[PDB]
Amino acid sequence: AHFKEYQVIGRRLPTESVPEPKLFRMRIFASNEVIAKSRYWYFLQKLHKVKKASGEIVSINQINEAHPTKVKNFGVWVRYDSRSGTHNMYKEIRDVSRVAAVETLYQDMAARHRARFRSIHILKVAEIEKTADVKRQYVKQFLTKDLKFPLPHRVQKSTKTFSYKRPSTF
Amino acid sequence: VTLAQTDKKGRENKERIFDEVREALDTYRYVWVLHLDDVRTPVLQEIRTSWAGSKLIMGKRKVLQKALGEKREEEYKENLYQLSKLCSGVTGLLFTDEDVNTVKEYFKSYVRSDYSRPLTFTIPEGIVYSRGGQIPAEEDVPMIHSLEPTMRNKFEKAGKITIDSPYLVCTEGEKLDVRQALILKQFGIAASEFKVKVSAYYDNDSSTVESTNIN
Amino acid sequence: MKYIQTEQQIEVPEGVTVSIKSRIVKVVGPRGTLTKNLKHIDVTFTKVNNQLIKVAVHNGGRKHVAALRTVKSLVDNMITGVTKGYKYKMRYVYAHFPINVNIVEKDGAKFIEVRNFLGDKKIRNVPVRDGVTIEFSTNVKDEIVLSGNSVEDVSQNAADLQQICRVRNKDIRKFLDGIYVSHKGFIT
Amino acid sequence: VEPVVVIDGKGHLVGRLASVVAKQLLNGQKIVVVRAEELNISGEFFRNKLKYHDFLRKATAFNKTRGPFHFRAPSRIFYKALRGMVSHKTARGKAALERLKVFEGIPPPYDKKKRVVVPQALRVLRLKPGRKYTTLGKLSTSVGWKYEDVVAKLEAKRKVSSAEYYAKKRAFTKKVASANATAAESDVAKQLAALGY
Amino acid sequence: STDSIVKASNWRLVEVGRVVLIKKGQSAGKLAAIVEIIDQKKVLIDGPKAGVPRQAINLGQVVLTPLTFALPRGARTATVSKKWAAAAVCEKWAASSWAKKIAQRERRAALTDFERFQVMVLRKQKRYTVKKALAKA
RNA sequence: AGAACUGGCGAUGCGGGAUGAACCGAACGUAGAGUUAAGGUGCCGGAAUACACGCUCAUCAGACACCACAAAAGGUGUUAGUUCAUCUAGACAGCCGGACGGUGGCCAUGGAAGUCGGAAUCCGCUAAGGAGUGUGUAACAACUCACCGGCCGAAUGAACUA
RNA sequence: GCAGUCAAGCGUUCAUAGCGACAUUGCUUUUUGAUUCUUCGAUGUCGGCUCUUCCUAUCAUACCGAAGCAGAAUUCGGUAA
């Protein structure tokens, strides 16, 4: 769905003789609130020895985009599970917001490398501030000055089943 | 894919020649840059052994341009950048310290004979030979038949190779083809003279740029 | 990887003019006129000024861009044929049977005739295409010379002339008869 | 919207046309399809020949007459692809195929009437550019239709007669448009413009 | 007549400042100017005078209009609004025939039955003068 | 062929899997309106030739669990990736020039002079050039590469992952 | 198949744990075309006359490719029922 980027904060358990466990925050991409709490324990159990019954979640926050109408180049580090063993991948997306860029990534992974939602891990999504350090080629070609490209051979969608005009393109 | 012994040198060899030019300047007071486009390899060696006190360095252009310092402001020793701009051809720098007269006397006196890359020779209308009419044909040995598919293709009966029409490989007053150079080259005709030329001299302690031309 | 646009540049010298409606290309110059169809190749031609013409493919993949380079190679071959022209000179090595080659006109069709090839009584005919002139090389023994404006009119008729004389059921290393293309060059 | 609708067959795809025709016949509209020999099939030519040959060998072993009748004509090829879409064994399917008439070329009286096209079945709107297609008129010639030298000749006779009509029609519209232009600026013209005509 | 007659094949091509028309969506028939092109299929549009909010849109939902004006790449909404007035494209749009055709079928839908009667009586009067002017010359 | 826990068929229809005792939804009085399950929405056939990002061309393509098909291993066909090197002090491709003296090195010998062969296998001078990559003369020569150099001006090469 | 020599690959972070392809080397009755007439035992029923079709995994005819093929004669391979 429309992903929403969430901050989840976790505090293991207040016990006698160990007060104040430190605190643990993460940034989670999930389609709603309830998945992001469950996606939180999926990673945080891998990092150190906790459980959901030995845990509680402090607070959740919805992180909006800082600047939607600005156009950003994004470099995304991705770890994912293949049919063979897992291996890393670095990909670059040009998009409008952070949370819309992950939308175009999962579609890109499912198209080319046939990876569903459960196999992919999102390592770090970063904005590349300066230009001319863009590594990939297919992102780089839009950075040329005075870029103008035509859209030839446009089709037309007409509601009536019969048209009399012998219809023509552009 | 190959299995040859000799391997690529790399960037470090380009910085070694960058190192050799710097040390050669302050040691030997005269610097000589030359336009030597076509040279033979034993011709290059005998110039080195005729100048035993000298050090001679050949190398790539922008390396030798930067080793003198291609910028005006940046240089090893002073007034060095004007001579570096002049040398357009393939260069080999020279470092002798005896005389400004002996060196320009040497290159004008020195001359050899190499390939044309002038005079005209016709192939006789009989059986062709390796010399091709240089010596009398009774002393001549016929050409190898294996290089005849090279002659029917690249140069455009019995194993002795036969032409039926007379062919002229050169004509006088004419620029020779790159193909017509190879016709004289295969026959073994080194009748064109070869001479090396110099464009500029430099003196370190005088520290001025000298401009000249000999052809 | 969906290249956004790719272009090449076809140079036009002073002798020739080119007039292009949708994809039909006409080349008119000194030696003659040549035409070529291009409805299948899907490009866009654009003149800048009278000597350079850019071709362009917008938003095409690798297979679409690979066809764009050979469009430049076809139209450049058309221009040189109108200026310099093409000339293929062929020699025919016979072992024991002398090959008689003649040019006979059959109701206006101008067929190239081959006789006595390797002791065959079969009389082969090779038709001359439109826009190619065959003449025999004066003062050079054993040569047939093909010359024309178009590459595809000449080079096909050169290749058709050699495959009609192909040796069968024999070791080809010992039997060396045939007609071969010596070299490919220009008229001027 | 009309009693009998005449579909021009040129530049369409076999399947995507026959789908939208078969729904109109089951809804009661009468459709007559002309110029069948200009119809197109996606995919390259050598494919669609072999899709016909593996069909062509399928016939009843004990008596070849009783098997699938392999029709050759481009109308009959197209009528096949439509017949599989309508449930032709019931009484609803028989009365739905009596509303359909498919012809090669344009025979009289259908040359005097308007021909239409179907935008969701045009080749030039459906397939991507740089993609091989196949002309059905060439296809039936490769499998035994001995009439492409006749139907194409009658079209060259027709189009000359049709070009004379259009020039007479275009000059008459020129007189009307000139008369309509000088009729403008009148008080009846300006009141119409306010109302939008 | 030694000239190369090679055709141009003129096209509306996307750029910074190509004004467009949004056919479907929330906006539904409003003008807007492309601010920055994102990739092959998405752009970034804004029209402040018409009323469309600044948003990223797919090129499927938008149609290209031939009018252009000069505007720097990546401009904000205040800067597009100032360049919009200097070109005066809202006056240049209604001069075009394609804007008049939009307004005409809008007016023909809002015609009252009594006004639909008045359209009838006038066209009966207009055809009388035409058929006299026709069939004489 | 013989067991273990639970559900089902046998005794049980109805909707879905074209068809089917066992799968999926759901268990039945007679009827009306409403919303859904599993499954589906080009046409048969009720229902979007809806929207959105990509991939794939097959001279036997492919289309949905139970289920009616397939193996290793190959394929400059295409796509996205990893690790590595080269490069605006000029890379990759192209033409063009150099590719030498000790030394025709030693045994093999009718004769390989780098290249029928066998062991062996360094220096000199070098920007660089093998006691030699191949075409081969009966042995020579010559040509080519592998090594640099001059033109030439944007990235390129190699293995591997799926 | 067994007994070996390897190591192109793999073993959670890894050579020497543990496998381990293509390879490679060996006997199981005679390295000198001498022999050596060794047909060493299938435990539910089909064969042939007539007469059609179909599969291709092609013996012959058609056109091709490669050869370590002069011609002839053959050997190997492809399309093809």
Author numbering:
A (entry chain S): 2 to 171
B (entry chain W): 10 to 126, 132 to 170, 176 to 234
C (entry chain H): 1 to 188
D (entry chain O): 3 to 199
E (entry chain M): 2 to 138
Give verbatim lines from the article:
To isolate particles immediately after export from the nucleus, we used tandem affinity purification (TAP)-tagged mutant Rlp24 (Rlp24∆C), which fails to recruit the AAA-ATPase Drg1 that initiates cytoplasmic maturation. The EC particles could be further separated into two states: early cytoplasmic-immediate (ECI) and early cytoplasmic-late (ECL). In the ECI particle, the NTD of Nog1 remains inserted in the A site, displacing H89 and preventing Rpl10 insertion into this particle. In addition, the ECI particle is the earliest particle in which H69 is folded into its nearly mature conformation. As this coincides with Nmd3 binding, Nmd3 may promote H69 folding. However, Nmd3 also appears to drive the flipping of two bases, G2261 and U2269, distinguishing this structure from mature H69 and priming the particle for activation of the GTPase Lsg1, the release factor for Nmd317,28. Interestingly, in the ECI particle, there is no discernible density for the NTD of Nmd3, most likely because it is highly mobile before docking onto Tif6. Nmd3 binding in the E and P sites promotes two large-scale rearrangements of RNA: closure of the L1 stalk and capture of H38, which constitutes the second RNA helix of the Rpl10 binding cleft.
Ribosomes are the molecular machines that all cells depend on for protein synthesis. In the cytoplasm, the pre-60S particle follows a hierarchical pathway of assembly events coordinated with the release of biogenesis factors.
